[PDB]
C-alpha cells in the first residue's frame, strides 16, 4: 500500500552527487600523477 | 504493566550500528524513499536482524572462542542484570523469568550469573532467575498462569518481546523490557503503536538517521543507578505509581513516512 | 556494411570504469541477479550513461574548461582521428561526416582537428570532415542521399550510431564506428543482435565483469589509423578490410 | 529470465556484511589492547 514520504533516512546521502564527485575527484587526482 | 528500562549502547555497539547503516546505505535510501521490490525488502530484513543482534550483544560478531565474563564489558544489559541482583540481595524472593532470543547468549548469561553467585538456570519444557530462549516460550506460558502470585518477567531484547507477545497469550505478570537507547529496539518501541504499512520504513529510517550517552565510565555509573533504582523499586512491592525511570524519549519526529 | 574500429581505452578510463562499477556495486549486483523494481532500473540508467560518457571522453568529468591538444592524451578516439587524416593526406577526395552525441566534445574535436590543419568544421548546414552533433542528424539525412557517390560516415560513439541510424533511413554509403574495447560500447555491439528482454542485464553484467600502456596504446592506434587510411586509398575493398572484428562477449552474459 | 552468472565475481552482499562487522570487532580488540598497555 502506498505511502506519503516525509524525510530522507540518511540526511547527507545523495547517490547522484556522490557519483559526480567521485568521478571528478578521480580525474583531478590523476592529474596529480601527471604533475608527479 | 509493561515497563521499559532504557540502557545506553557501548562505543563498540554504536560503531557497529554506524558501519551497518553505511554498508546498507544504498538499500536503506532506496527502501525508505519509495516502493521497493521483494528482494530489497529481503535485504532490509537482514539489516533489521543485524541491528537486533548488535543490540543483543556485539560479540555475536566475534569469530573466536572467548572467556564467559568477557562479555559485560560492552553490554549495559549484562551489567544491569549483574547490578540488579547485587543490590537485590538474599532478602528478595520472587522468581524471575528472562526471555532472550539467542541460544549462545542465553548460555553465556546463565553461566555468568552463576559465576557471580546468582541462582540462575536455563528453562526447558524456584530459582532466583530462569533464563528462557524465546524459541522455547510455548512451554513457559503454561507456567506463567500459576505463579502470577509471584513471577516477574524480563525481556532481554525486543526481538524476544515481538516473538513471545505474538505466540503466547498476553501475560499476567510484571514485564520489564531492556531496551538499548538509540537502537532498533528504541525505534520498534516508538512505532509499536502502528504496525501499519509504514512500520518497517520508519524503524529503519530512525535507526539510519541516529547512526549516520557518552563514555565507558559514565555508562557504568548510569547503569548502576538504574539498577539500584529498579531493585529498590521491586523491594517495595512494585508500585506502578512510584516507578523511578523516565520513559524512553519519543522518536516519532524522526519518522520518514506517513 | 557497418565496419567497427575497436580502439583501446586509456588508463584513466579503465580507472573511472573501475570506480563507476564499484560505486554501483550493490545496484549492479541486485539488478543483474534477479527481478528489480522501476527505481532500480532508473538508477541503472545513470550507470549506463556514465559508462557512455567515459567512453566518449573522460574530460566530461573535468571540473574546469581546458585548451585542445590536451584531449588526445586520454582518448584513443581523438588520437585515431588525427592519425587517419594525417596519413590520408591531400590525395583522398571523399567527404567524411562524423557523428557525435555531445556538443562540448564536438566543438573540442573540431577545434583540435583545425589545430592539426585538418579541414574540419562544425555542421550548421565540401571540407575534409563535417563534425556533426547527433541531435542535428535529422538534417544530414537529406544530404546523405545525394552524395552517396562520395560521402563516408564515422560514428564517434554508440549513442550517435543508435540515434542517427533510426532517425534517418538506411545510409547506403560507408559506415565506420569508433568503439572502445571492453567498454559499454563493445557490450551494446555484442548484444544488439537479440532486441529482447535480457539486453540491459547483459550489457551491465558484461561491463561490470570487465571493470572488476601509454606508448603501446599510441602505437596500436597509429597502426589502426594507417591501415584504415591505406584501406580507404585503395578503393575501400570489402575483402581486404584490415581490422579484426570485435571479440564476442556472449560468454560473459549473466542472463538468458 | 534465468540468471547464469554474477556480474561482479568477487561481490557478495550478505557475506561482506558478516566480514565487515567481524572485522570491526577485531579492530576494537586491538584498540582495547593498546589502551591497556598505554
XYZ file of C-alpha atoms in Angstrom:
588
model
C 0.000 0.000 0.000
C 1.215 3.480 -0.996
C 2.865 5.867 1.494
C 3.476 9.611 1.867
C 7.225 10.244 2.187
C 8.268 12.946 4.655
C 12.032 12.666 5.004
C 15.302 11.014 3.926
C 16.642 8.151 6.130
C 20.280 9.249 5.762
C 20.176 13.088 5.574
C 23.561 13.645 3.895
C 23.196 10.692 1.487
C 22.971 11.765 -2.165
C 23.634 8.975 -4.669
C 23.786 11.167 -7.787
C 26.079 13.847 -6.341
C 28.386 11.244 -4.782
C 28.867 9.786 -8.269
C 29.539 13.194 -9.857
C 32.008 13.969 -7.052
C 33.972 10.706 -7.005
C 34.414 10.613 -10.798
C 35.690 14.215 -10.824
C 37.798 13.516 -7.718
C 39.485 10.656 -9.602
C 40.040 12.838 -12.679
C 41.890 15.634 -10.855
C 43.849 13.156 -8.696
C 45.034 11.550 -11.944
C 46.353 14.988 -12.965
C 48.387 14.937 -9.737
C 50.391 11.962 -11.034
C 50.705 13.785 -14.372
C 52.495 16.554 -12.452
C 54.292 13.972 -10.298
C 2.076 -3.052 33.237
C 4.822 -3.293 30.600
C 7.734 -1.070 31.674
C 10.848 -0.064 29.711
C 14.410 0.124 31.032
C 16.460 2.379 28.761
C 20.111 1.294 28.788
C 22.892 3.052 26.798
C 24.848 1.411 23.972
C 28.624 0.986 24.188
C 31.069 2.738 21.840
C 31.502 -0.622 20.052
C 27.752 -1.068 19.519
C 27.463 2.460 18.081
C 30.400 1.888 15.728
C 28.745 -1.339 14.579
C 25.419 0.443 14.043
C 27.252 3.145 12.067
C 29.070 0.523 9.958
C 25.806 -1.374 9.394
C 23.845 1.651 8.137
C 26.823 2.662 5.963
C 27.024 -0.835 4.415
C 23.256 -0.687 3.771
C 23.286 2.997 2.770
C 22.003 2.498 -0.803
C 19.459 -0.144 0.251
C 18.095 1.972 3.125
C 17.836 5.092 0.946
C 16.020 3.074 -1.735
C 13.620 1.322 0.657
C 12.812 4.431 2.706
C 12.106 6.837 -0.186
C 9.676 4.839 -2.340
C 8.204 1.454 -3.429
C 10.796 -1.341 -3.432
C 10.894 -4.876 -4.859
C 10.681 -8.137 -2.881
C 14.459 -8.684 -2.885
C 15.122 -5.194 -1.477
C 12.680 -5.999 1.341
C 14.507 -9.311 1.894
C 17.766 -7.377 2.356
C 16.119 -4.925 4.759
C 15.104 -7.900 6.923
C 18.809 -8.778 7.157
C 19.525 -5.168 8.163
C 16.882 -5.412 10.890
C 18.240 -8.780 12.084
C 21.804 -7.411 12.271
C 20.559 -4.386 14.238
C 18.759 -6.721 16.659
C 21.977 -8.737 17.020
C 24.136 -5.679 17.793
C 21.516 -4.667 20.378
C 21.638 -8.136 21.960
C 25.433 -8.331 22.158
C 28.228 -7.112 19.806
C 30.180 -10.325 20.471
C 27.710 -12.133 18.202
C 30.233 -10.894 15.587
C 33.263 -12.318 17.389
C 34.736 -15.214 15.399
C 36.756 -16.655 18.267
C 36.035 -18.685 21.406
C 36.067 -16.261 24.325
C 36.260 -16.435 28.099
C 32.286 -16.174 29.876
C 32.868 -12.993 31.943
C 34.467 -11.216 28.971
C 31.057 -10.007 27.976
C 29.693 -7.431 30.452
C 32.415 -5.062 29.178
C 30.365 -3.993 26.151
C 26.789 -4.735 27.267
C 24.796 -2.416 29.538
C 22.275 -5.267 29.677
C 24.658 -7.797 31.248
C 25.908 -5.128 33.675
C 22.321 -4.160 34.523
C 21.411 -7.764 35.371
C 24.559 -8.141 37.499
C 23.993 -4.939 39.487
C 20.280 -5.699 39.916
C 20.861 -8.932 41.859
C 23.887 -7.371 43.594
C 21.540 -4.798 45.163
C 18.575 -7.178 45.487
C 20.461 -9.435 47.922
C 19.098 -12.666 49.567
C 16.098 -10.875 51.120
C 14.015 -10.685 47.919
C 12.317 -13.959 46.952
C 10.322 -13.715 43.717
C 11.161 -15.908 40.712
C 12.331 -14.025 37.606
C 11.692 -15.113 34.026
C 14.107 -13.660 31.467
C 13.450 -14.069 27.740
C 16.322 -13.821 25.251
C 16.214 -14.526 21.514
C 19.648 -16.163 21.201
C 20.837 -19.588 22.381
C 24.523 -18.694 22.751
C 23.800 -15.587 24.839
C 21.280 -17.496 26.968
C 24.051 -19.979 27.820
C 26.684 -17.279 28.393
C 24.346 -15.174 30.564
C 23.233 -18.189 32.634
C 26.831 -19.277 33.254
C 27.991 -15.733 34.002
C 25.267 -15.064 36.592
C 26.143 -18.323 38.383
C 29.765 -17.103 38.354
C 28.685 -14.073 40.420
C 26.717 -16.205 42.931
C 23.253 -15.686 41.416
C 20.827 -18.630 41.379
C 20.149 -18.618 37.623
C 19.419 -21.502 35.224
C 18.049 -22.267 31.729
C 14.360 -23.010 31.078
C 13.167 -26.228 29.398
C 9.860 -27.995 28.716
C 12.064 -21.942 42.030
C 15.453 -20.330 41.074
C 16.316 -16.656 41.572
C 16.014 -16.241 37.770
C 15.032 -18.522 34.870
C 16.827 -17.788 31.573
C 14.488 -18.681 28.705
C 15.247 -18.870 24.983
C 12.375 -17.141 23.164
C 12.022 -20.205 20.906
C 11.023 -22.270 23.963
C 8.331 -19.764 25.013
C 5.379 -22.111 24.105
C 6.163 -24.121 27.259
C 6.657 -21.238 29.719
C 3.201 -19.728 29.016
C 1.588 -22.638 30.880
C 3.715 -21.809 33.938
C 3.022 -18.072 33.573
C -0.585 -18.728 34.647
C 0.188 -20.379 38.010
C 2.949 -18.197 39.512
C 1.383 -14.737 38.713
C 1.184 -14.627 42.520
C 5.000 -14.293 42.365
C 6.766 -14.313 38.960
C 8.370 -11.247 37.323
C 9.285 -11.153 33.608
C 12.302 -9.556 31.897
C 12.776 -9.287 28.141
C 16.498 -9.138 27.398
C 15.684 -7.923 23.878
C 12.758 -6.603 21.824
C 13.029 -9.454 19.299
C 12.106 -11.791 22.177
C 9.242 -9.451 23.087
C 7.964 -9.362 19.486
C 8.176 -13.168 19.320
C 6.697 -14.014 22.735
C 3.836 -11.472 22.593
C 2.570 -12.812 19.252
C 2.822 -16.537 20.074
C 1.684 -16.669 23.715
C -1.496 -15.121 25.224
C -0.906 -11.776 26.971
C 0.981 -12.461 30.206
C -0.384 -11.749 33.692
C 2.827 -10.590 35.392
C 5.281 -7.699 35.785
C 7.024 -7.172 32.427
C 10.385 -5.383 32.272
C 11.940 -4.579 28.887
C 15.663 -3.965 28.433
C 15.765 -1.516 25.517
C 19.003 -0.025 24.193
C 18.821 3.752 23.751
C 19.066 4.753 20.086
C 18.907 1.155 18.809
C 16.304 -0.582 16.616
C 14.712 -1.654 19.915
C 14.035 2.009 20.737
C 12.643 2.538 17.219
C 10.364 -0.517 17.400
C 9.129 0.824 20.765
C 8.182 4.228 19.301
C 6.303 2.744 16.322
C 4.756 -0.228 18.149
C 1.502 1.769 18.163
C 1.191 1.421 14.371
C 2.333 -1.887 12.801
C 0.821 -0.391 9.634
C 2.284 -0.138 6.116
C 4.895 2.410 7.255
C 6.200 0.384 10.217
C 9.329 -1.129 8.638
C 10.133 2.102 6.780
C 10.009 4.208 9.965
C 12.092 1.952 12.246
C 14.767 1.693 9.528
C 14.680 5.441 8.829
C 15.015 6.417 12.500
C 17.848 3.947 13.102
C 19.547 5.110 9.888
C 19.318 8.759 10.986
C 20.510 8.103 14.546
C 23.513 6.109 13.277
C 24.629 8.454 10.470
C 25.037 8.990 26.089
C 28.837 9.024 26.318
C 31.899 7.099 27.547
C 32.660 3.831 29.381
C 32.882 5.351 32.876
C 29.604 7.281 32.540
C 27.742 4.263 31.096
C 28.703 2.178 34.149
C 27.525 4.917 36.545
C 24.158 5.291 34.786
C 23.654 1.510 34.557
C 24.266 1.012 38.289
C 21.983 3.921 39.235
C 19.230 2.462 37.042
C 19.875 -0.977 38.577
C 19.805 0.307 42.178
C 16.554 2.196 41.491
C 14.778 -0.801 39.925
C 15.923 -3.149 42.707
C 14.781 -0.685 45.385
C 11.514 -0.428 43.445
C 10.977 -4.214 43.356
C 11.686 -4.478 47.103
C 8.859 -2.005 47.784
C 6.006 -4.024 46.262
C 6.424 -2.890 42.617
C 4.267 0.264 42.786
C 3.069 1.445 39.363
C 2.886 4.963 40.831
C 6.460 5.152 42.140
C 8.232 3.745 39.067
C 11.545 5.707 39.146
C 12.669 5.638 35.498
C 11.798 8.257 32.826
C 10.170 6.626 29.747
C 12.150 6.240 26.523
C 12.252 9.532 24.609
C 9.874 9.683 21.637
C 11.463 9.397 18.182
C 8.276 9.969 16.146
C 9.649 13.297 14.854
C 12.444 11.318 13.168
C 9.878 9.340 11.134
C 10.271 9.240 7.338
C 6.772 8.183 6.209
C 3.005 8.582 6.783
C 28.143 -2.920 -44.062
C 28.888 -1.320 -40.678
C 32.645 -1.656 -40.107
C 33.771 -1.468 -36.477
C 37.030 0.155 -35.382
C 37.994 -1.181 -31.960
C 40.109 1.327 -30.041
C 41.718 0.723 -26.602
C 40.690 2.670 -23.501
C 43.249 4.787 -21.646
C 44.418 4.012 -18.107
C 42.236 6.894 -16.854
C 39.100 5.475 -18.499
C 39.679 1.990 -17.043
C 40.153 3.527 -13.580
C 36.918 5.509 -13.966
C 35.134 2.362 -15.187
C 36.507 0.545 -12.125
C 35.360 3.371 -9.833
C 31.968 3.534 -11.571
C 31.230 -0.180 -11.142
C 32.486 -0.015 -7.535
C 30.124 2.897 -6.790
C 27.228 0.989 -8.401
C 28.233 -2.423 -6.984
C 25.099 -3.060 -4.875
C 22.774 -1.787 -7.617
C 24.509 -3.770 -10.377
C 24.535 -6.969 -8.302
C 20.846 -6.544 -7.408
C 19.784 -5.656 -10.957
C 21.709 -8.444 -12.677
C 20.920 -11.403 -10.388
C 17.131 -11.153 -10.099
C 13.896 -9.171 -10.746
C 14.132 -5.485 -9.827
C 11.758 -2.528 -9.476
C 11.274 0.581 -11.638
C 13.552 2.718 -9.449
C 16.499 0.294 -9.552
C 16.207 0.323 -13.355
C 16.179 4.143 -13.259
C 19.441 4.210 -11.281
C 20.970 1.678 -13.706
C 20.259 4.190 -16.496
C 22.650 6.575 -14.718
C 25.323 3.851 -14.596
C 24.890 3.211 -18.334
C 25.061 6.932 -19.203
C 28.189 7.402 -17.061
C 29.764 4.468 -18.917
C 28.968 6.131 -22.264
C 30.418 9.423 -21.012
C 33.682 7.738 -20.000
C 33.782 6.008 -23.409
C 33.154 9.358 -25.140
C 35.892 11.193 -23.224
C 36.986 11.217 -19.530
C 37.236 15.032 -19.615
C 33.444 15.252 -19.460
C 34.311 14.842 -15.754
C 36.761 17.755 -15.783
C 35.539 20.457 -13.374
C 37.162 23.321 -15.302
C 37.496 24.161 -19.007
C 40.687 23.400 -20.921
C 42.547 24.163 -24.124
C 42.591 21.376 -27.468
C 45.698 19.143 -27.703
C 45.245 18.047 -24.087
C 42.389 15.775 -25.108
C 44.095 13.216 -27.376
C 46.288 12.419 -24.347
C 43.480 10.336 -22.819
C 41.286 9.437 -25.819
C 42.427 6.968 -28.482
C 39.394 8.144 -30.474
C 40.910 11.626 -30.764
C 44.343 10.148 -31.495
C 42.819 7.832 -34.123
C 41.151 10.726 -35.961
C 44.378 12.785 -36.014
C 46.417 9.895 -37.432
C 43.757 8.972 -40.010
C 43.683 12.400 -41.685
C 47.437 12.872 -41.177
C 48.166 9.689 -43.148
C 45.192 10.180 -45.503
C 46.970 13.252 -46.927
C 45.538 15.661 -49.592
C 45.285 12.784 -52.101
C 41.941 11.371 -50.894
C 38.906 13.313 -52.149
C 35.796 11.943 -50.425
C 33.976 13.849 -47.673
C 33.558 12.454 -44.139
C 30.621 13.050 -41.798
C 31.490 12.349 -38.151
C 28.550 11.999 -35.760
C 28.979 12.618 -32.014
C 26.475 12.827 -29.142
C 27.985 15.722 -27.149
C 28.128 19.409 -28.121
C 31.173 20.282 -25.981
C 33.176 17.391 -27.445
C 32.005 18.271 -30.966
C 33.370 21.810 -30.526
C 36.548 20.486 -28.897
C 37.097 17.898 -31.654
C 36.647 20.423 -34.489
C 38.949 22.967 -32.840
C 41.630 20.306 -32.342
C 41.492 18.965 -35.908
C 41.672 22.600 -37.044
C 44.728 22.760 -34.761
C 46.418 19.976 -36.767
C 45.500 21.618 -40.109
C 42.774 19.093 -40.920
C 39.952 20.717 -42.891
C 37.261 20.109 -40.258
C 34.223 22.241 -39.385
C 31.014 22.048 -37.329
C 27.875 21.185 -39.307
C 25.441 24.102 -39.422
C 24.123 23.206 -42.879
C 32.821 20.097 -49.152
C 35.524 20.167 -46.393
C 37.596 17.162 -45.288
C 35.300 16.244 -42.356
C 31.971 17.567 -41.006
C 31.790 17.246 -37.204
C 28.050 16.857 -36.646
C 26.138 16.570 -33.366
C 23.860 13.507 -33.274
C 20.909 15.676 -32.177
C 21.239 17.540 -35.500
C 21.137 14.294 -37.522
C 17.566 14.818 -38.938
C 19.124 17.470 -41.211
C 22.119 15.493 -42.528
C 19.929 12.560 -43.697
C 18.648 14.636 -46.616
C 22.250 15.233 -47.720
C 23.263 11.599 -47.129
C 21.066 10.719 -50.131
C 22.767 12.908 -52.767
C 26.481 12.364 -52.022
C 26.414 8.501 -51.583
C 28.599 8.775 -54.686
C 31.262 10.190 -52.324
C 30.390 10.589 -48.624
C 31.696 8.317 -45.844
C 30.344 8.251 -42.275
C 32.111 7.928 -38.909
C 30.183 7.309 -35.692
C 32.276 8.574 -32.793
C 30.136 6.887 -30.114
C 27.410 4.236 -29.974
C 24.725 6.722 -28.874
C 25.476 8.699 -32.037
C 25.121 5.453 -34.014
C 21.802 4.420 -32.460
C 20.272 7.916 -32.689
C 21.209 8.572 -36.328
C 20.604 5.019 -37.620
C 16.952 5.027 -36.533
C 16.013 8.686 -37.094
C 17.307 8.612 -40.680
C 16.569 5.934 -43.342
C 19.229 3.344 -44.236
C 22.507 5.090 -45.119
C 23.741 3.462 -48.335
C 27.303 4.798 -48.136
C 30.289 3.721 -46.000
C 29.747 3.467 -42.224
C 32.660 3.401 -39.746
C 32.114 3.041 -35.971
C 34.581 4.034 -33.254
C 34.111 1.519 -30.429
C 36.192 1.326 -27.238
C 37.382 -2.212 -26.450
C 35.838 -3.566 -23.245
C 33.571 -0.525 -22.800
C 29.764 -0.381 -22.746
C 30.018 0.322 -26.497
C 31.607 -3.100 -27.087
C 28.909 -4.646 -24.880
C 25.989 -2.979 -26.698
C 27.507 -4.081 -30.029
C 27.547 -7.748 -28.957
C 24.004 -7.815 -27.536
C 22.399 -5.625 -30.232
C 21.571 -8.845 -32.128
C 18.648 -10.004 -29.984
C 16.371 -6.976 -29.423
C 14.761 -8.564 -26.343
C 14.432 -8.565 -22.539
C 17.855 -9.727 -21.269
C 19.564 -6.800 -23.011
C 20.169 -4.306 -20.167
C 21.109 -7.061 -17.715
C 23.768 -8.408 -20.088
C 25.448 -5.131 -21.099
C 25.611 -4.057 -17.440
C 26.794 -7.508 -16.301
C 29.467 -7.739 -19.008
C 30.797 -4.223 -18.331
C 30.706 -4.873 -14.569
C 32.790 -8.041 -15.042
C 35.345 -6.367 -17.325
C 35.800 -3.492 -14.845
C 36.193 -5.609 -11.689
C 50.295 1.022 -21.659
C 50.554 4.670 -22.767
C 53.091 4.297 -25.599
C 51.655 0.951 -26.751
C 48.142 2.459 -26.845
C 49.667 5.212 -29.008
C 51.368 2.667 -31.294
C 48.313 0.443 -31.846
C 46.050 3.427 -32.568
C 48.630 4.766 -35.038
C 48.803 1.355 -36.751
C 44.999 1.103 -36.913
C 44.721 4.623 -38.371
C 47.396 3.909 -41.011
C 45.659 0.659 -42.011
C 42.226 2.290 -42.360
C 43.742 5.185 -44.336
C 45.604 2.736 -46.592
C 42.333 0.805 -46.954
C 40.393 3.942 -47.924
C 43.017 4.942 -50.512
C 42.712 1.584 -52.294
C 39.004 1.997 -53.088
C 37.579 0.583 -49.835
C 37.612 -3.067 -50.927
C 35.398 -5.294 -48.786
C 37.606 -8.404 -48.826
C 40.722 -6.508 -47.722
C 39.303 -4.742 -44.647
C 42.404 -4.819 -42.373
C 40.977 -4.748 -38.834
C 39.805 -7.829 -36.852
C 36.125 -7.846 -35.721
C 35.288 -7.054 -32.097
C 35.700 -10.168 -29.957
C 32.433 -11.843 -28.947
C 31.386 -11.195 -25.338
C 28.402 -13.596 -25.284
C 30.334 -15.929 -22.938
C 30.258 -13.217 -20.248
C 26.451 -12.980 -20.368
C 24.762 -13.052 -16.949
C 21.218 -13.968 -18.059
C 19.136 -15.874 -20.653
C 14.908 -14.639 -17.055
C 17.431 -17.267 -15.955
C 20.471 -15.892 -14.144
C 23.535 -17.968 -15.010
C 26.361 -15.783 -13.633
C 27.180 -12.979 -11.175
C 28.007 -9.551 -12.735
C 30.743 -8.798 -10.179
C 32.543 -12.125 -9.425
C 34.071 -11.088 -6.078
C 30.934 -9.317 -4.785
C 28.713 -10.934 -2.152
C 26.375 -8.636 -0.224
C 25.337 -11.000 2.587
C 28.888 -12.324 3.121
C 30.579 -8.898 3.060
C 28.251 -7.804 5.886
C 29.414 -10.597 8.205
C 33.009 -9.846 7.164
C 32.846 -6.086 7.828
C 31.033 -6.452 11.177
C 33.503 -9.133 12.366
C 36.423 -7.072 11.032
C 35.210 -4.157 13.160
C 35.055 -6.403 16.232
C 38.764 -7.248 15.906
C 39.600 -3.566 15.322
C 38.088 -2.835 18.747
C 40.149 -5.617 20.370
C 43.358 -4.019 19.073
C 42.187 -0.659 20.419
C 41.372 -2.355 23.746
C 44.858 -3.899 23.937
C 46.529 -0.589 23.027
C 44.606 1.173 25.820
C 45.575 -1.483 28.391
C 49.280 -1.125 27.549
C 49.301 2.686 27.324
